[PDB]
């Protein structure tokens, strides 16, 4: 707690970047990102829950997840992480329209899976995984974010729509959707009633022609309508590592 | 300009930033961060190349802290211009997208640095023609840098920033640059663009062009100092001959700031 607190005198909040689970670029012993949560003058109960989550993030460390640097309470709850100069995967794919070579697509998927596997090995469900939460850092690594505050549509699993209902398996389906994004350059269904009941699912015929057959199949496994039929991240990750070498 | 050429083997073109004046802007690497503007030209004819080289000729001799530092050019695979990177994006993005709220003193500072940049360009016989918030950049070090002033003679041979005589036609001049600067001041002091309520282009053109419609000065901040508002109005005069020059604009600002 205390040792991770970044008093508001120590940090310069800069340009507003956008919204997630509200994000600014900032300064604190170098560049950072600061997420301002929608809370000021927290009640003791909110403060407590917040301290609990910061308790989890404190102990998370992996090259493929956003590095946690500290939190603030005044004037607003906030979370500070390292800055990712390469914007988000969502921005790269659907806005600036960057076209990565298939090697790079496979690489991004792999790094994402490494971070997700790590989170899950740490008993952290993401619940919100999407191309918007996948940031590209200057060193060319990929960092998953927005996994904080655990205990507190295009990427949603059918069971998560037709209400837990969240689970590790629903995370896996989100990752399937990200794979779809990577291999079609598009978002799916480009509704709730139809995906929830399993008569509508992402159109896999759309995927790139040079997408390796094992990637396409893994995407399909991750996107299965009944969650028990989805592969865990340990197996997802091994399968990606095998095919990337093959 | 052999010495200013940057062959494609020396630059790593990165993420697309957007479409500025004359071309498309990417972030890149060349002995550090750079911006590269890719012009809409590949396989230039000898005449395009020559025109482009003359322009590089001007750019290589320009140097002022309130204008993008020219770093060099490429001819292949496509014509390109390379300049220093501005980590703070554009004035336009700050005021209108991320709705950053500057204190009045920074607003005045931004107006001032821009004036210093514009004054510099004009002292250099360079007409901007495209001055707007979209091409006024905020550097990491908190300086402002004007861009898109490259290629003057090629433009020679955005309606919201356009002086009347430019709309109702080459009617470009130093004075129309001045009118543009006035629109930036309007943006700075009102936090908004002019004619915001008017969802129709050809309306703005016809009326502004004829002198019956002009930016609404009643919308400017309470805390905006009288001389700044006055200067803003002098800059926006419909008759180009009644606009001050940048030497006068800059001195007026230097003076009201103190
Ligand atoms: C340990 C993680 C805690 S968390 O689960 O709560 N996630 C978290 C916390 C705080 C943040 F600020 C962010 C966050 O969004 C970014 C962080 N570092 C970035 N670096 C760069 C861009 C970014 C630039 C430009 C963009 O273009 C629109 C998009 C994204 C975003 C971030 C975040 F994900
Ligand atoms: C010597 C001047 C020659 S010129 O007349 O041709 N101008 C010129 C040349 C080449 C360029 F790349 C640019 C140019 O646009 C930027 C330059 N350095 C930037 N640094 C940062 C953002 C920028 C980030 C993020 C944004 O967020 C949307 C917006 C703008 C743009 C530039 C430019 F103005
Ligand atoms: C402990 N941590 C620095 C890895 C977040
Ligand atoms: C010489 N310089 C124009 C690049 C500054």
UniProtKB/Swiss-Prot annotation, chain A:
Changing residue 192 to R: No effect on MAP2K1-mediated-BRAF-KSR1 dimerization, however loss of BRAF-mediated phosphorylation of MAP2K1. Changing residue 130 to R: Blocks EGF-induced ubiquitination and ERK activation. This is Serine/threonine-protein kinase B-raf. Monomer. Homodimer. Heterodimerizes with RAF1, and the heterodimer possesses a highly increased kinase activity compared to the respective homodimers or monomers. Heterodimerization is mitogen-regulated and enhanced by 14-3-3 proteins. Heterodimerizes (via N-terminus) with KSR1 (via N-terminus) or KSR2 (via N-terminus) in a MAP2K1-dependent manner. Interacts with MAP2K1 and MAP2K2. Found in a complex with at least BRAF, HRAS, MAP2K1, MAPK3 and RGS14. Residues 11-243 form the Protein kinase domain. The active site is at residue 128. Changing residue 18 to V: In a colorectal cancer cell line; elevated kinase activity; efficiently induces cell transformation. Changing residue 133 to S: In a colorectal adenocarcinoma sample; somatic mutation. Belongs to the protein kinase superfamily. TKL Ser/Thr protein kinase family. RAF subfamily. There is a cross-link at residue 130 (Glycyl lysine isopeptide (Lys-Gly) (interchain with G-Cter in ubiquitin)). The modification Omega-N-methylarginine is found at residue 197. It is linked to Defects in BRAF are found in a wide range of cancers. The chain holds residues 448 to 720 of 766 of the full protein. Methylation at Arg-197 decreases stability and kinase activity. Ubiquitinated by RNF149; which leads to proteasomal degradation. Polyubiquitinated at Lys-130 in response to EGF. Changing residue 149 to R: In LNCR; also found in an ovarian serous carcinoma sample; somatic mutation. Protein kinase involved in the transduction of mitogenic signals from the cell membrane to the nucleus. Phosphorylates MAP2K1, and thereby activates the MAP kinase signal transduction pathway. Phosphorylates PFKFB2. May play a role in the postsynaptic responses of hippocampal neurons. It is found in: Nucleus; Cytoplasm; Cell membrane. Brain and testis. Changing residue 138 to K: In ovarian cancer. It comes from the Eukaryota. ATP binds at residues 17-23, 35.
UniProtKB/Swiss-Prot annotation, chain B:
ATP binds at residues 17-25, 37. There is a cross-link at residue 132 (Glycyl lysine isopeptide (Lys-Gly) (interchain with G-Cter in ubiquitin)). It is found in: Nucleus; Cytoplasm; Cell membrane. Changing residue 63 to H: Loss of MAP2K1-mediated-BRAF-KSR1 dimerization. The modification Omega-N-methylarginine is found at residue 210. Residues 11-256 form the Protein kinase domain. Coiled coil: none annotated. Changing residue 210 to K: Increased kinase activity and stability in response to EGF treatment. Changing residue 37 to S: Reduces kinase activity with MAP2K1. Brain and testis. It is linked to Defects in BRAF are found in a wide range of cancers. Monomer. Homodimer. Heterodimerizes with RAF1, and the heterodimer possesses a highly increased kinase activity compared to the respective homodimers or monomers. Heterodimerization is mitogen-regulated and enhanced by 14-3-3 proteins. Heterodimerizes (via N-terminus) with KSR1 (via N-terminus) or KSR2 (via N-terminus) in a MAP2K1-dependent manner. Interacts with MAP2K1 and MAP2K2. Found in a complex with at least BRAF, HRAS, MAP2K1, MAPK3 and RGS14. Belongs to the protein kinase superfamily. TKL Ser/Thr protein kinase family. RAF subfamily. Protein kinase involved in the transduction of mitogenic signals from the cell membrane to the nucleus. Phosphorylates MAP2K1, and thereby activates the MAP kinase signal transduction pathway. Phosphorylates PFKFB2. May play a role in the postsynaptic responses of hippocampal neurons. This is Serine/threonine-protein kinase B-raf. It comes from Homo sapiens. The lineage of its organism: Eukaryota, Metazoa, Chordata, Craniata, Vertebrata. The chain holds residues 448 to 719 of 766 of the full protein.
């Amino acid at each position: 707690f205390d040792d991770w607190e970044i008093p508001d005198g120590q940090i310069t909040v800069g340009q507003r970047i956008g919204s997630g689970s509200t994000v600014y670029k900032g300064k604190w012993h170098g560049d950072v990102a600061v997420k301002m949560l929608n809370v000021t003058a927290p009640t003791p109960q909110q403060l407590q829950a917040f301290k609990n989550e910061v308790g989890v993030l404190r102990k998370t460390r992996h090259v493929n997840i956003l590095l946690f640097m500290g939190y603030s309470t005044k004037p607003q709850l906030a979370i500070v992480t390292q800055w990712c100069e390469g914007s988000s995967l969502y921005h790269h794919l659907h806005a600036s329209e960057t076209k990565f070579e298939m090697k790079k697509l496979i690489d991004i998927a792999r790094q994402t899976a490494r971070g997700m596997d790590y989170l899950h090995a740490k008993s952290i469900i993401h619940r919100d995984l999407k191309s918007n939460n996948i940031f590209l850092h200057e060193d060319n690594t990929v960092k998953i974010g927005d996994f904080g505050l655990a205990t507190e549509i295009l990427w949603m699993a059918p069971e998560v729509i037709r209400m837990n209902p969240y689970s590790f398996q629903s995370d896996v389906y989100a990752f399937g959707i990200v794979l779809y994004e990577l291999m079609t350059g598009q978002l799916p269904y480009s509704i709730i009633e139809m995906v929830g009941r399993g008569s509508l699912s992402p159109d896999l015929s759309k995927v790139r022609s040079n997408c390796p057959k094992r990637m396409k199949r893994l995407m399909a496994e991750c996107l299965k309508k009944k969650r028990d039929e989805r592969p865990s991240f340990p197996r997802i990750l091994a399968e990606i590592e095998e095919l990337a070498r093959e």
